């Protein structure tokens, strides 16, 4: 034990040595599919910026997945400081990208500079095809190692990025094939969240195919989620605001069931473990309903979607399961307080049905004890 | 948007730009204290290896924390490939350390090669003092930047490492002072887990002080945890095995309360979010009790500690909240099946009390519905 015991891992080698701090669980399917999501998220960030209007996700018969976007294309020109194409830099260097300021993407779900480079690292093979600057470029990688320099292989009028990857089985175990339904659920949700972006999903294994292009936003997303439940009130509460540089968008409606289903998103990335947006939502829900009950003389069945747009959010893991930016709590909480109280005044009937379900649950416990 | 839009973050700059993927939540106190834990974990890994027998954690009156160990000392000699002292490499290079193989630490809670380097990155100041090779060495950093080369400042017979850091307030917000009790709880738990390592905690603010040197292992840890609850049975179930290169150690006892408190650890690091060790524990608990009930003609109040030793575990975030190595499920599950069934045969009285509480809960629901 001395100075020769200390090893430095360079390039993408650290990712292959310790995948879980980057990609999550490489044994239950979730990190495998998160590989796709990292790539799709980059396309989505072109769409947010206004440049991409179609996304095509294909599950190939050889268990690879491609994501095609019609955005601006990953930059192709030689990187001054690094001396190789900017595209190769992106694919091979951790904490390298165009989202560390707000000049290329005002708001974006990427922010770590590691996503596609992590997909590369954990792919036995990867294929990159970029249309920009009137040219088609293309490069191949194996286990993150470029096989040759980014190369012009044609002319075109189109711009866009195509990434196809075959995941390494020396990394992913147990669940090793892509599941249509997991990719579908995510891409469907993304369509509600990105009105006007055409998002296609194709399974070359059995020829199954979906085209998601929903137009009603998260309000329609809530209708969809209650399709085969029974909503107890007709008016879905909805608002979209931006104040103090934070966008807050909320839709919700109660059904006659007994589960709570709250979807939280930050710049289109889902938070399984919630966070400061969720905590603001709950605080405003509590405060607003209790003021409505005080004034009128007085969880279960709730479906809600909470989507925020934030210039530099903070997540407590690479995979972004929990948003931990505390100023986002205050933002959702005050926007919601204000607009939810207006909703209850403007729809007295909905208000009463909802408050009645709430009280029925309280009485039910009380009748038990 | 072109190749000049693509920025590379070098050294420790990425950590300062996106702290949460490394340190967790920098707004609620948890990441602040995790700074201490990263440093303490490195000491603990010397203890696991058999080299460190005392650890002194001091909260200083200027809100800095020092951790002193009597282990081998961070290597001081110039690193061949990197050309600076191995110690400076450790402090300044991500994914750099002595735990990527098993030559320096057979088992260890570190594994990413990033912990202390992350503490450095997020410290407005850091002080390193290393006793090895008959010399005292010392180096200072500010915001992760070394102020001068590692330097010999004396002779000594001792070996050990001292790290003192002052956390940056441009990173940590809301909770910015160290809380005695948070450090105490963790260090206490560590003492149960590392019998024979003297672990001291000193608060130079008010002169409060603790010395943790518990000898009964996780069995004693369970007694402690039930101190001020009421255990319903006298015999704490306990075992420590190592098979197939995985160590599994479990203690548990039921009290007459109604909460479940299961502490999981991997190579001494706690998993707030559980994982494959927890899932193995639960599977074996279910199977073993149901076989005991079948044979005898037939969560609440449980306290349990599950500690595993694994050569290369996999966590799904830098902060290690969830162990995601699936072979650890099978290991805990079979060791526990085997030894828990023996415990129930060997202590028929305990067995009956425990199974009676379990059934009482089932009946209570049933009497409700
Ligand atoms: N589909 C894409 N279209 C255009 N540019 C992209 C695309 N994917 C990646 N990039 C560029 O490569 C950069 C690095 O991507 P990534 O490594 O995934 O990190 P991040 O998205 O967190 O920056 C992005 O910031 C962006 O500038
Ligand atoms: N207290 C210590 N005593 C001896 N060596 C240490 C100590 N702390 C750190 N090191 C060495 O520095 C290396 C890098 O530490 P760190 O960056 O925290 O990553 P990791 O613990 O995951 O390797 C460790 O692997 C170890 O070799
Ligand atoms: Mg990305
Ligand atoms: Mg460490």
Numbering used by the authors:
A (entry chain A), B (entry chain A): 5 to 302, 316 to 386
Q: Mind quoting what the paper says about this structure?
A:
Type II DNA topoisomerases are essential enzymes that catalyze topological rearrangement of double-stranded DNA (dsDNA) to maintain chromosomes in an appropriate state. In particular, DNA gyrase introduces negative supercoils into covalently closed dsDNA molecules using the free energy generated by ATP hydrolysis. The GyrB subunit is comprised of three domains: the N-terminal ATPase domain (GHKL family), the transducer domain, and the C-terminal TOPRIM domain. Here we report the structures of bacterial GyrB43 in complex with (i) the pre-hydrolysis analog ADP⋅BeF3, (ii) the post-hydrolysis ADP⋅Pi and (iii) the product ADP.
